[PDB]
Symmetry: C4
C-alpha cells in the first residue's frame, strides 16, 4: 500500500477509446436508480468509481419532483463501481453534499462534501470515511467546489473552491490536503477572472486545472500550481471556444472572451505544451452533443484551426457536464499518467417536459492505438410514467 | 486485530459536522426499503454501521399497516453501512428483536436482541453472530434496553436494561459482557429514579450513560460506572431541559423535574466536567426539530443559561429518537475518543395520516474546526400510495 | 483452514433461543423475493447460510402460478446469509435441483442437487461449486434426499437418499463423501421401514439421522452410523408422536406406528441417551404450529409423558418442514457440538386460496441459559395482489 | 497467483451433468433483470462468471422495445456469478460492446468489447478493467468476435475476429494477446470458408475453434492453431450437421455443406481424435431444442451415424446460441482440461409477439459418471405486461 507518486508526465494520446456507459436513466425507468447529477469518475490503485450527487430520491418516483433544484438538505455524495447504475443497492455513502470532490492518494479515499445554507455552507473533508477537517464559506455566497476528482501527488491532494457571485467577481482558493487535513491554502489573485468547477489533474509533480468562467468568458480559465501552491493563471487562447454557451469559432483570446461569456458548463481540457485536447459540446447555445478536439497550439495560440476532431455525442443528443480523470502508473503499469474523461448526459428539466432532472454517464480513456468517433447518447425515452 | 483500549478521554468539541443522511423514507416511496424505527449507529475499528429494528415489512406495502405498534414477533435487528438505506438487499441480519443494543470490542460484534412475550421477554446475546448468552425478564414487564450502542473498554462491553412499569418505579440493571458472555451484573439502587433507553459511551476507562425518565422527569437521568460496575447516579441539573415533552426552560433540578415529566423520548448528552453537550428536540411538546446546546455548567448547575446552540432540524420538521456513538482512536488515529450522534426522523403515525410508522436518520461528528447550523429533515412527502 | 473434527458430543440443552427470522413472504409482497420451499440452514467455520429450493420465480408475479408443484426444470438450489430474504440480489447460485442437501467440511461447501425426470433423476455433487460426482436414480422413482444439511466428520460428509414409492416399501442408501466424491455407499436393509428427508447430525464421530416415514408410521424412523457406514435402525419409541399427520398422544411403539401413518412432513429430533428433544407441529392433522418437547426416555420408551415443552409457533399459525443444523466447536469455540433447528413456515396452496406456494423461516439454537416460549409465525396477509 | 498452464489434454467425457440455470426471463417478469442476448460463461482459477451483452434496459420496461436489434450505442458487456440473474444490482461492468469475448489467464481478466459504427467498429481490450489495446475494423463491415470465452495458454490468450459480409467471403484474423496487449495476429487464408462467432478452447497447449459459417455451410467450420498462430482449417465432416438451419442428417462433407447453408447460429463442438461431441438445436429450421451427440468419427468421417445422444432442451422449446467453456486443472484439481458448455434460451422477437428480445441460460459440464437427458427450457410465459 503506497502513495501515488504523480511525478511522471501526462501520456500523449491520439484518440479516445470508450471506457464506460451506465445507461442510468434508461434503467431507472423500471429499476431503483438514484436521481443524480454532477457525476464524476475517480480511481484508486485498484479500481475506478463513479461519484455522484443524489437528490435523495429515485427515478420515476414522486420525490424526483423539482430536482432541477441545485441545492437541498437531501443531496448526498455517493459512489459505485464505474459503469454500474447508481442504486441504493450498489452505492457506497460518502458524504452529505450538494457540491463535492474526491480522490485517492494511493492509501485512502479523500472526499469533500459541501452542505448547509447558501450563506454559510461547510465543506466536510473525510479520509477513509472519517471526518478529518472542515472549511466554512468565507464570502457567505454558495461555497462550491470541483464536481470532479481532486489531484494527488506524493501524499498530498489538491482542490479548488469558490465563494461569491456566479455573475461577477468571486473568490477562489487552492487547497493542499494531507490525510484529509488542510495543511495549506492560498487565495488566487485573479481580478477579472472567474473560476468554477475546476477539472484538475497531476502532470509531472504539478497540478493543472481547467475550469468554468460563469461571469464573462466563453473560453475556459486555467490555473496551475506546484505542491507549494505557487500558481499561474490564464485562459485557453484557442479560437476553438470551450465553454457553453459560446460564440461560433473565430479568433480567440488569452483573456476572458466576453461574447456569450455569461453562464457556462463544467468542462475540462488537457494541456500538452502549446497544444490542448479540448472536450466541448457540439452546440454553441445548449448542452447538446460532445466532441474531442486536438489543437496543437490551442493553449497559447488564438487562431481557430485544429488538427483532430472526434465525435462523442451527436449534436441532436443531450450532453452536459464533463470532467477529466487520470489513471496513475500505480494502477496501469504504464510509465506515464493516462488521461481519461467522462461526460454527464442530462435528461429532464429545463429542456424536457418532465418533473425531474437527472443524468447518465459515459467515459473514455486516451490511447495511441486506433479509435473511432460515434454517438453514445443517454437513450432514454421521455417523459416517464411519473411525469 | 486488537481490543479497543477505551482509556483516553472524550474529545472536547466546539461544533458538529454532518456525517451521514440516508433519506430512507424518500427512497422507500419506490425502492425496497424496510419499515424501521429505533435506528442507531455503532463502529468497529474498520467501519461504522447503522443498526435498526425492522417491522418485517417494506415501505409502501400493505404489511407496513399498523407499524406504530412497538413489539411483535416480526421485528428484527439488522444493520447496513452508515448512510445507506436499510434494504433487504444490503442489510445484514443480526437478531430477532423489538429492543436492542450492539457494539464492537475491537475483535467482534456484540449484539443484544430482546424478543418474546411482554411478560417474559428474553435478551439473546451474540458475539460474531453466534449465540453466547441470554438474560430473561426478571420483573415480567417488558424487558428493554438501549436502542443505541453499548460501550466497550479493554475487552469488556457494558449495557443497561430495564424491567417494570413505564409510568412508575421500575428495575434497572447494569451488565458487563465479555466475548458475548455476561460476567457480572448489578441492580441499580435508584428509588425515585427512572431509567430507559440509555445512551452510553466510554470515557477514560469508565462508562457514562444518559437516559430517559418516562415516569416523572423532564430532565434526563444519568448513571456512570467503572469496569467493576461501581456506579454513581443523578440527573442533569441544567435548566435547559433535555427530554420531550418538557416545560419551557427555567430553573432546573439535580433530581427528576416533575413538570411535564411523564412520557419522554430516547436521547443523549456528553459530559465534560461540569459542562454538557445537550441534544434535544426544539419543541417542548412534540418530537419536532433538533438542536445541540453547549452548557458549560449544565451537568451540575441548575440555571437556564447556555453558551452555544447549533440547529440540526427545523422546529417545523419531524425528529424523534437520538443517541450517542463514539469513534475510538483505533479507528480515527486521534489521541481521544470522538463523540458523534445520530437522530431518528420519524414519519407516519400517530401525528401523520398514514397506516404506517417509519424513520430515516442523520448523524453528526464532533469537531473543533468550523461548523454550521441548518435543517436536514426527512423530506418525504406523505401520505404514500399505500395510505 | 482445517477440517471439522466432529468428535465431541452434542451439547445438552435446556431450551431454545431464537436465532433468525427472515420474514420472506411479508417482504416479498413488494420486494423481489424468490418463491421457495424446502429451506434449510447450514454453517461453515465462518458463517451460517440459508439454503433453499427456488421455483425460478418471484413472489407476487404471474410465474409463481402453480408453485404447489414439487418438481420442475426451473427449481434451483440457492443460498443466502441466514436471516436475509432469498432474493436474486443477495443469493448465491448452488445447483439446479428439486431436492437437495449441503454441508461444509471445514474447507469447502459440498452441495447435492437432484434434477431430471422422475424416472431417471440425477444427483449432481459439487465441491466448492465444481462438479465432483453424480449418482443416478437406481429405482427410477423420484430419487430424493435430505432437504437439510449433510453431516461432516473429519473430512468425510454423509447423506441419505431414497428411491422408490412414497406409499410403500422403498430403497434407502447412505453415502460417504470426501471432497465431493462418493467414496462409499451402502443400501440399508430396512424391510417395513420407510425413510425420507432425513435430518442428520454428527455426535461423537458418528452420524444420527431422524427422518420421515411416508408409508405407515406416525412416529419417526431413525438411522445411525459410523464413518464406515456400519449402521443401526429403528423408530422413536415415544408416545409423543413426531410426524404429521399423527394420532393423539398415547402409548407409542419402537416400530412404525400405523395409525395416521400415511403421508407426513420432514422433521428432526436430537437424541441424548434414552432421551430425546422432539420438534413437531402442534396440530395432529395439518402443518400448523410448532413446539419443542424434551422427553427424558422418549428415544427408547413408549409412554406419552414428557418433562419440557416450549412453544415455537402458535397452533393457529402455519408451519411446515423442520430440520436440524449444528454449530461445530470450530465455529463457536465451545467444547461440544451445539444443536440448532429451523422451521419452514409454508403459505399459500393447498390450504390458502392463492395461485402460489412459498415459505419463510425461523431458527433457534440450544442453550442452557433462560429461554421463553412464544409464537413467531410467518405473518403475511394473504391473498396477494397476484391472486 | 499463477498463469494457467493449458498444457494438459481435454478430459474425455461420457455425458453432461447440469451445472447452472438462471431463469432470467421468468424472474425479470417482476425483478430488475437486464434485457440481454449473447451470454457466455468463463472461469478464473477461483470462480465462473456469466458474461452477457445488455441492451441497456430492463425486462418489462418500455426501453426493452425493439431489442431484436443487434447493435446500438447502449449495449454493454457485463458479468455476474454463474447461475445468477443479470441485474444492475449484481452485475460488474466490463465494457461498452455489441460484440464481445473474455477470458482469464490465471492472473487477470481479459475482456474484448466492440462498439462504434458498422463501418468502423473498434474492439477495446481490457486487462483487469484497464484499457490495454484497441483494434479497428479493417474491412469496414461490422467487425465482430466470439460471443464466447477466449482461450488462454501459458500467459497468452487467443481469439478470432471477422470483418466483411455475412452472406459471402469475409476476412478472418487470429489474435495472440498477452496482458491485454496484441502481440501477434495473422489473417487466415480461407477462400470459400466463412468464420463467425468461434467457440475456442485450449487442449494440449494448442487452440481449437468451432465456428459459424453464415455464407454457405450447414456444417461448422473449424480452425486450430499453436501459440505461434500456425493454423489449420477445415469443416466438421460428420453427416450430423451442426448448424441451424441445416438439412436433415445425411452424407456430410469435409467442406462447406451448401444445402441450407445460408444463415446460421453460434455453436460449438469438442474434438477428440477423429471423434466429436456435437451440440446442436433439435430443429433443422429454427432455434428450438438442444442436444449433445457423440460421434466417434464425426470430425473426419462423413456418415450420419452416431453413438450417443443426450437431450438438453425439448424440440418444442426455444433455444439459441451455444458455446464451449473449459475448467482448467488450476480450478478443478484434475489432471486434464474439463469441457463444459452453455446454451442461450432466446425469448421474444422475431418468433414471439413481444416488443422485446432477451435470453436466459443453462450450462452443463462433462463427466464420466452417470447422467440423464431431459429438458431445461426457459419457462417464461409470454407476452409480458409491457407487450
Ligand atoms: C410535481 O409538482 C407539480 C407542481 O407542484 C405537481 O403539479 C401540481 O399538482 C398540484 C396538485 O394536483 C396542483 O395544485 C397544481 O395545479 C399542479 N401544478 C402544475 C404546474 O401542474 C405534480 O403533481 C407533482 N408531481 C408528482 C408526481 O408529485
Ligand atoms: C394462474 O393459473 C390459473 C389457472 O390456469 C389462471 O386462472 C385461469 O385463467 C384462465 C385465463 O383467464 C382461464 O381460462 C381459467 O378459467 C382460469 N382458471 C381458474 C381455475 O380460475 C390464472 O389466471 C393464473 N394466474 C396468473 C397470475 O397468471
Ligand atoms: C449555481 O450554479 C452553479 C452550478 O451550476 C449548475 C449547472 O447545471 O450549470 C449545477 C450545480 N449544481 C450543484 N453543484 N448542486 C451548480 N453549483 C451549485 C453549488 O449549486 C454555477 O456554477 C454558477 O455559480
Ligand atoms: C413502551 O414504550 C417504551 C418505548 O417507547 C418508544 C417511543 O417511541 O416512545 C418506542 C419503543 N419501541 C421499541 N423499542 N420497539 C419502546 N420500547 C419497547 C420495548 O416497546 C417506553 O420507553 C416506555 O417504557
Ligand atoms: C413427493 O413428495 C415427497 C415430498 O413431500 C413434500 C411435502 O410438502 O410433503 C415436498 C417435496 N418437494 C421437493 N423436494 N421439491 C417432496 N419431494 C420431492 C422430491 O418431490 C414426499 O416425501 C413423498 O415421497
Ligand atoms: C449480423 O448478424 C450476425 C450476428 O447474428 C446473431 C444472430 O442472432 O444470428 C446475433 C448477433 N448480435 C450481436 N452480437 N449483437 C450478430 N452479430 C452482430 C455483430 O450484430 C451474424 O453472425 C451475421 O454476420
Ligand atoms: C518518480 O517517483 C518514483 C517513486 O519515488 C521515483 O523512484 C522516480 O525517480 C520518479 N521518476 C522520475 C522520472 O523522476
Ligand atoms: C491506554 O491504553 C494503551 C493500550 O494498552 C496503553 O498503552 C496506554 O498506556 C494507555 N494510555 C493511558 C493514557 O493510560
Ligand atoms: C477431537 O479431535 C481433536 C482434533 O484432532 C483431537 O485433538 C482430540 O483429541 C479429539 N477429542 C477427543 C475428546 O477425543
Ligand atoms: C504442464 O505445465 C506444467 C506447469 O509448468 C509443467 O510443470 C508440466 O511439466 C506440464 N505437463 C506436461 C504433461 O507437459
Ligand atoms: Ca462562460
Ligand atoms: Ca490552433
Ligand atoms: Ca420524561
Ligand atoms: Ca448553565
Ligand atoms: Ca421493484
Ligand atoms: Ca407418516
Ligand atoms: Ca416419556
Ligand atoms: Ca450456415
Ligand atoms: Ca459418424
Amino acid at each position: 500500500s503506497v502513495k501515488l507518486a504523480g511525478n511522471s508526465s501526462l501520456c500523449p494520446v491520439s484518440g479516445w477509446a470508450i471506457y464506460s456507459k451506465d445507461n442510468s436513466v434508461r434503467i431507472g425507468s423500471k429499476g431503483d436508480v438514484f436521481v443524480i447529477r454532477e457525476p464524476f469518475i475517480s480511481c484508486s490503485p485498484l479500481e475506478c468509481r463513479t461519484f455522484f450527487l443524489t437528490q435523495g430520491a429515485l427515478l420515476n418516483d414522486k420525490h424526483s419532483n423539482g430536482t432541477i433544484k441545485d441545492r437541498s438538505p437531501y443531496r448526498t455524495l455517493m459512489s459505485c463501481p464505474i459503469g454500474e447504475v447508481p442504486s441504493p443497492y450498489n452505492s457506497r455513502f460518502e458524504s452529505v453534499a450538494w457540491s463535492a470532490s474526491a480522490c485517492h492518494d494511493g492509501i485512502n479515499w479523500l472526499t469533500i462534501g459541501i452542505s448547509g445554507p447558501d450563506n454559510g455552507a461547510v465543506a466536510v473533508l473525510k479520509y477513509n470515511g472519517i471526518i478529518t477537517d472542515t472549511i466554512k464559506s468565507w464570502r457567505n455566497n454558495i461555497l462550491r467546489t470541483q464536481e470532479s476528482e481532486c489531484a494527488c501527488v506524493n501524499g498530498s491532494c489538491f482542490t479548488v473552491m469558490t465563494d461569491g457571485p456566479s455573475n461577477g467577481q468571486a473568490s477562489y482558493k487552492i487547497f493542499r490536503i494531507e490525510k484529509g487535513k488542510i495543511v495549506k491554502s492560498v487565495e488566487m489573485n485573479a481580478p477579472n477572472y472567474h473560476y468554477e468547477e475546476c477539472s484538475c489533474y497531476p502532470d509531472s509533480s504539478e497540478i493543472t486545472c481547467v475550469c468554468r468562467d460563469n461571469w464573462h468568458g466563453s473560453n475556459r480559465p486555467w490555473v496551475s500550481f506546484n505542491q507549494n501552491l505557487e500558481y499561474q493563471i490564464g485562459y485557453i487562447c484557442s479560437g476553438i471556444f470551450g465553454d457553453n454557451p459560446r460564440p461560433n469559432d473565430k479568433t480567440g483570446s488569452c483573456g476572458p472572451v466576453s461574447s456569450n461569456g455569461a453562464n457556462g458548463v463544467k468542462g475540462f481540457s488537457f494541456k500538452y505544451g502549446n497544444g490542448v485536447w479540448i472536450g466541448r459540446t457540439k452546440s454553441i447555445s445548449s448542452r447538446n452533443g460532445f466532441e474531442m478536439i486536438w489543437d496543437p497550439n490551442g493553449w497559447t495560440g488564438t487562431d481557430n484551426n485544429f488538427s483532430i476532431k472526434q465525435d462523442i455525442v451527436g449534436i441532436n443528443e443531450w450532453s452536459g457536464y464533463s470532467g477529466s480523470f487520470v489513471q496513475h502508473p500505480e494502477l496501469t503499469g504504464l510509465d506515464c499518467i493516462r488521461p481519461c474523461f467522462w461526460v454527464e448526459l442530462i435528461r429532464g428539466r429545463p429542456k424536457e417536459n418532465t418533473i425531474w432532472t437527472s443524468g447518465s454517464s459515459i467515459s473514455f480513456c486516451g490511447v495511441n492505438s486506433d479509435t473511432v468517433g460515434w454517438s453514445w447518447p443517454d437513450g432514454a425515452e421521455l417523459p416517464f410514467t411519473i411525469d
